[PDB]
Ligand binder design. Structure first.
Ligand SMILES: O=C(O)[C@]1(O)C[C@H](O)[C@@H](O)[C@H]([C@H](O)[C@H](O)CO)O1
Ligand SMILES: O=C(O)[C@]1(O)C[C@H](O)[C@@H](O)[C@H]([C@H](O)[C@H](O)CO)O1
Lengths: 496, 497
């Protein structure tokens, strides 16, 4: 009964259905796969710097597009020939829908309402994909012509260096124009301000003035949607995506506790940016901060599952690791599981065969109960400028030294097997090279563990955990090495 | 004004006044030095595992002591000779006070009231100094006979591995006996439960059950003081020292937000353990957490000022660096600056001549305005078991890479000089263009080598002149890129109005 909020990105549908000539019936069929699942809300993203619909205030993705022309036309000249094909799929499918008199977002909203799903619009507030290519098709002409509106003029080390500065009245006006348009065009249940595309909105050093500035913006948005409530005759929700820790969120000019205490929002999605799902987020701290405000707190998953920022492995979550992250977060008081980049194809779990089951299981502790789950150690990808970073892996243990890893495993396990699994990097070990304890109790050596994906490219060794040692919430692995060893992977496997 | 809370530890007075014969008048005079300062409360600590007063429920520090005997006597046997002298100064002075019918805490409490100072008792909840020496004088017999009550039986790698397990009913009862005696013997304005000596109270992995346990314990302390409030005829406050970040505080079984919301405590002191003062603590998050509770939030300073955990430097704060910490934390909304280890001698600021000035300035922005201050980058020394650590220094910048440091420098500077000062390790001297330095994106001019007064590193510190208008209220962001590989070991803002 917490349920699932699921995000469809601005590009996916147009890329993956490219070359078909979609009937209204096919377009509608896309909502149906989520019908009768634990999905309460579809968060339909219509935009990056450009819209995928036929906007009158912003650039549609096809601004500059010659439908009858060759791939190397001006709009696409800047990509290599292979990506021209990919990008033209998105551009051409979205344009061809428009020419057919099909508004994909109005169709999806109307289909959502018929199948008993609450339809949301989620707006990217500051997308910067491929801003290293200034002639790139998916940039607004507003962006292209106003380099003086970028947050970091003195350097280009990162895409977020060329993000819009919401410190500028013209940047806030530009984004308010789209919001005004979306609220007039579409009869949604909720607008979501996706601050986490890409989370960086201000000059470095200006984030405190920043926090005042996004609070006043969110209030003007709330007052706008109030007026539309009278025009639509129903309640219209305002939500926001924000970083996973309060100090990083406030540090990036997002004071959500103020937004919450003032009734500017009624839903908040704590999340990482992209580099990995966080399996461990301070949900109970947020619940205390948000107490009495009646905001829905949603715990945001990402599709990738990676042990540390510099890992060369890029694989996704499986049903077992999502079950792990969901069991844990629901257990900490998350009032929704929010999925991002978990779409029906291309950007999606690698075990796509299990997507129907996933959408029917991870919205409730009751449906995850007695089901195999995996609780993997990852990291927070997002930090405020100069904010000290806390990255648990990789971690070297010298001989005679102790290291501890805490992992949140949500509800006390059902009867069955519990394994503490540790990945060792650099080419190793015997049964006594590690001494392993969970909550102080000695674990038996099991041997090499045959992990299914996601998995590291180095040996993972299993330690058997006395079932009685396992506790509700955090469980503490404490290891000592008799040989210098570097860990690059840690999880609990639970098999009821 | 927010003002100052100042903690007197359980051993300092007895050590420093050793061999004097102390009359009631001299004992009282220890308070007077704080009279007319910005100090509002003195936190009088009467205990480690042993009491410094003549307890009837716990071991006094002199349990086993032969007053007439030599230094080489059972109680002191375990120390080497030159530490016997020091320990014995504490033991004999605490004992001799008692023998003369002087209850030092009763005299200090009484004298606090005469001087307009609010008198508090601060209990050490789980002191573990020298638990490596099971024979040591300062351990309780209860601790010595009951190794099965310790929080980590399977290794000894840290003093906190031999701390009491507050998950045991026997450990709670042992600690509640002292509290019950403290409330009956001393008519104090408040009790502080100092959890932060040494912050580690539960078996590894038991910290969530721990959280319910310390809330229930706190609640019995409040119910006990409610009774004494009727007996004594005035309000008695209850406070706690807890970690500096709410995540770390809850991960060690301290759920202070529950204590506040339920009306158990009316002062929380956020603090490091010891290894350094934190110049940067999330005061705004704590104020949001504590909103509408009426709890006083005090920002805890320690006397050491060190740049990273592995630093071999062990220099203290100066007046300039406490001015800096104080300006910053009051400007974020601390309702008290709380001083631990800033005593009148031995455990003291190294520039001790400036102690009277410090006590009349750091408790208000008004008394800090117009004064030179230093804002130094340090680190948080305390982290919950398995909790990932965020430690900004040292930081290595490769040629063409950028590195950011955020330092909270409180109110916008008055007109004057603002220096971003950066210490570079590894026996390198840079040029004026080896570093490009920016503050809130504005290009800083090269000043040269800065002449720092202590605390200072033992490597060169290079000054960058910051345009005044660039300096912002609160956090100010140093961004640096190196044209040669460098390691930073120090960062600070110097503000000279
Ligand atoms: O933001 C993202 O994490 C992402 O959703 C990932 C997805 O795999 C990719 O196809 C889209 C796409 O790059 C944008 O929609 C273009 O604007 O972006
Ligand atoms: O905890 C501390 O930081 C400290 O207060 C520091 C001080 O410099 C030292 O003298 C005392 C003493 O070690 C205890 O009082 C023993 O019980 O400890």
């Amino acid at each position: 009964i917490p349920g699932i909020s699921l995000n469809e990105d601005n590009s996916h549908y147009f890329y993956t259905r490219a070359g078909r000539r979609l009937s209204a019936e096919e377009v509608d069929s896309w909502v149906d796969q989520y019908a009768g699942t634990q999905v309460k809300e579809l968060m339909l993203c219509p935009n990056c710097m450009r819209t995928s619909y036929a906007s009158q205030v912003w650039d549609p993705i096809w601004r500059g597009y010659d439908p009858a022309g060759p791939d190397d036309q001006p709009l696409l000249a800047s990509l290599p020939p292979e990506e021209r094909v990919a990008a033209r799929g998105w551009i051409h499918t979205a344009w061809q829908l428009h020419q057919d008199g099909i508004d994909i977002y109005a169709r999806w909203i109307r289909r959502c309402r018929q199948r008993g799903i609450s339809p949301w619009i989620s707006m990217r507030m500051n997308d910067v994909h491929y801003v290293n290519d200034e002639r790139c098709f998916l940039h607004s002409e507003f962006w292209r012509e106003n380099p003086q509106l970028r947050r970091v003029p003195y350097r280009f080390a990162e895409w977020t260096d060329r993000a819009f500065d919401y410190g500028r009245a013209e940047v806030r006006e530009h984004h308010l124009k789209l919001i005004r348009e979306l609220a007039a065009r579409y009869d949604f249940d909720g607008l979501e301000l996706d601050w986490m595309r890409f989370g960086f909105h201000f000059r470095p050093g200006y984030e405190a003035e920043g926090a005042e500035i996004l609070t006043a913006f969110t209030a003007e948005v709330r007052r706008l949607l109030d007026d539309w409530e009278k025009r639509r005759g129903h309640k219209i929700h305002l939500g926001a995506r924000i970083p996973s820790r309060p100090a990083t969120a406030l540090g990036l000019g997002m004071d959500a506790v103020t937004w919450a205490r003032r009734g500017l929002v009624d839903m908040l999605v704590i999340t990482p940016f992209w580099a990995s799902a966080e399996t461990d987020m301070p949900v109970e701290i947020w619940r205390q901060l948000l107490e009495g405000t009646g905001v829905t707190l949603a715990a945001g998953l990402e599709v990738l599952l990676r042990p540390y920022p510099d890992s060369p492995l890029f694989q996704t979550n499986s049903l077992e690791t999502v079950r792990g992250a969901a069991a844990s977060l629901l257990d900490r008081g998350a009032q929704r599981i929010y999925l991002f980049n978990y779409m029906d194809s291309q950007t999606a779990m690698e075990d796509l065969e299990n997507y129907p089951t996933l959408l029917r299981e991870i919205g409730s502790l009751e449906t995850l109960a007695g089901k195999p789950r995996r609780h993997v150690l990852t990291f927070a990808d997002t930090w405020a400028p100069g904010e000290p970073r806390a990255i648990p892996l990789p971690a070297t243990c010298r001989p005679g030294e102790w290291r501890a890893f805490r992992l949140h495993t949500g509800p006390k396990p059902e009867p069955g097997e519990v394994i503490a699994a540790l990945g060792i990097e650099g080419g190793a070990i015997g049964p006594e090279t590690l001494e392993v304890r969970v909550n102080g109790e000695l674990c038996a050596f099991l041997g090499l563990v045959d992990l299914s994906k996601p998995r590291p490219d180095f040996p993972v060794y299993g330690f058997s955990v006395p079932l009685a040692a396992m506790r509700r919430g955090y469980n503490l692995i404490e290891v000592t090495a008799r040989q210098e060893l570097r860990f690059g992977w840690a999880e609990f496997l639970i098999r009821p």
